């Protein structure tokens, strides 16, 4: 009952340079949005750095 479809990055089609395109499958009928939204909001601000 706690067994889901554990996913994986099937490919990293890094298009050209300083640009990647990472596809992850398979997730549940609803987990693509929650992982996309979680990673999108964290990368946007939380991720630190210098400028």
């Amino acid at each position: 009952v706690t067994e889901f479809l554990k996913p994986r990055l099937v490919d990293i089609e890094q298009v050209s340079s300083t640009h990647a395109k990472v596809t992850l499958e398979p997730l549940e009928r609803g987990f693509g949005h929650t992982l996309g939204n979680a990673l999108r909001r964290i990368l946007l601000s939380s991720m630190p750095g210098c400028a």
Partner: peptide, 12 residues
């Protein structure tokens, strides 16, 4: 993913 996993080690 490391940041989000370190923000959940007080639950699991």
């Amino acid at each position: 993913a490391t940041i989000l996993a370190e923000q959940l080690e007080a639950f699991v």
